[PDB]
């Protein structure tokens, strides 16, 4: 393989991935075209530029010794390769809920700030993408230190995974299960973003003099970049800067071996002591895996950015795009009520799987969306208008019984329509999962498309129930709640 052929291929890849979106109906074809080009490049390269002679668990002792010398907690847990979640931490003694059992001083972290002071510093000061996007900066920080045998962070880097289950690693037929879903567009964007960035930085490293000292000047493969961005997207956090005035992105060694379970955030940054601190989410008996709660993300975010699907995610949600139509004769009034309420005229809202399917913001939007002219004037004029605006997001204080019946009818119809745009039904998806033997990645894709439809089906039932509740209040001429 010649370096001129790879440079030609990355130039073609850069041009392909910088073109504008060819319209949603050609996105699958574009995705496959980009995949074909990436795989041609990947097959002509040697995988990860830097690989380590030992097994991943061979390096966990060095991680512990390094973390201990720099003031981190290293007693009371051990690293175990769990089947369901991969490597994680297991308690070696009983740990009580709310016990401060894990702490990591700032010196151990990799941050945008440590990226700036490293060998990447010169190129960082020149490139507009690196300056604007701390996540990409972290990824290149990871790669440069990985390729630096004397790096301070070598004990952390040598214990990182070598592969991930983000969609960047899926086969084409595994992504194909997601055709017609909401999620697949984010899969497309992730793949095109990553390919464009790889080609862009491949050329930048060649052309910039400030990149002459980087080990990436000698070797920078697609596999390198896919590994680095996947390492960052599955593990990065936001912390305050040392001054406490701004926030920065970081990687937190040792702590980021914890796997996810449902609960509440119990990890916080301690600025007085300058360290990350983790208290136990629940009691952990000796021999039990130590879990944390990653955050209130949807399963689409867990799959695309974290590389796993979480069963019983109580924060799961899908998107729903809604806006007041400029052809509506009440557009001006509706837009103004929405503006006074702090809500855009058009937006992407969320439908949740939990007991309230819609947020206060979505409820307020739908109320205005279905308001009559008389109702709109009562939200625009007079000494009670701001009071009425103030309660627009509150389920307890409807505008009118008729307004509620109209809005839940609309939501029922729209969620029903959204269900009819999927290639498969919920029952078909359950049959696929029961009757076929599938890879982990394939199961993630199918569970994701199943989960989108299950949220919409629950919204249909929820809206139908609410429509009947408010139709009852209307027929019984119940007094409206006030104040």
């Amino acid at each position: 393989v010649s370096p001129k052929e790879i440079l030609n291929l990355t130039s073609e890849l850069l041009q392909k991935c910088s073109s504008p979106a060819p319209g949603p109906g050609k996105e699958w074809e574009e995705y496959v075209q980009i995949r074909t080009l990436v795989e041609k490049i990947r097959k002509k390269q040697k995988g990860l530029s830097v690989t380590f002679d030992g097994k991943r668990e061979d390096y966990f002792p060095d991680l512990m010794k390094w973390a201990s010398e720099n003031g981190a907690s290293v007693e009371g847990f051990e690293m175990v390769n769990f089947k369901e979640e991969g490597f994680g931490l297991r308690a070696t003694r009983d740990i009580k809920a709310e016990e401060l059992f894990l702490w990591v001083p700032r010196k151990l972290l990799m941050t945008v700030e440590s990226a700036k002071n490293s060998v990447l510093g010169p190129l960082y000061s020149q490139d507009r993408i690196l300056q604007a996007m701390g996540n990409i900066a972290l990824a290149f920080h990871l790669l440069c230190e990985r390729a630096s045998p004397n790096s301070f962070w070598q004990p952390y880097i040598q214990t990182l995974p070598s592969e991930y289950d983000t969609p960047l690693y899926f086969e084409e037929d595994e992504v194909r299960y997601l055709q017609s879903t909401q999620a697949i567009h984010d899969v497309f964007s992730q793949y095109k973003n990553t390919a464009r960035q790889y080609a862009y930085f491949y050329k930048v490293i060649q052309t910039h003099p400030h990149a002459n000292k980087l080990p990436l000047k000698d070797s920078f493969t697609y596999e390198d970049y896919r590994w680095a961005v996947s390492s960052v997207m599955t593990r990065q956090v936001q912390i305050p800067t040392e001054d406490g005035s701004r926030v920065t992105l970081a990687l937190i060694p040792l702590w980021d071996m914890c796997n996810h379970t449902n609960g509440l955030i119990t990890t916080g940054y301690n600025l007085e002591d300058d360290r990350c601190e983790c208290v136990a989410l629940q009691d952990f008996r000796a021999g039990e895996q130590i879990y944390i709660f990653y955050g209130t993300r949807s399963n689409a975010e867990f799959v695309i950015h974290s590389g796993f699907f979480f069963d019983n995610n109580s924060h799961d949600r899908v998107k729903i795009k809604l806006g007041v139509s400029k052809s509506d004769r009440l557009y001006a009034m509706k837009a103004e009520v929405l503006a006074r309420a702090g809500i855009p005229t058009s937006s992407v809202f969320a439908l949740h799987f939990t007991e309230p399917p819609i947020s206060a913001q979505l409820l307020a939007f739908l109320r205005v969306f279905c308001m009559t002219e008389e109702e709109l004037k009562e939200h625009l004029l007079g000494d009670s208008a701001i009071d009425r605006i103030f309660t627009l997001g509150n389920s307890e204080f409807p505008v009118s019984w008729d307004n509620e019946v109209k809005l839940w009818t609309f939501l029922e119809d729209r969620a029903s329509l959204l269900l009819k745009t999927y290639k498969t039904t919920i029952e078909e998806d359950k049959s696929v999962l029961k009757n076929h033997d599938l890879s982990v990645r394939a199961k993630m894709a199918i569970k994701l498309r199943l989960g989108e439809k299950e949220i919409l089906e629950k919204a249909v039932k929820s809206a139908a129930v609410n429509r009947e509740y408010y139709r009852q209040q209307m027929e019984e001429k119940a007094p409206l709640p006030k104040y």
Partner: peptide, 19 residues
């Protein structure tokens, strides 16, 4: 509660052409 809550794998924008 926590002054600086820490979210593992916090979702960031990777679209270098958008914002």
């Amino acid at each position: 509660t926590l002054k600086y809550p820490i979210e593992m794998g916090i979702v960031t924008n990777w679209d270098d052409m958008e914002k």
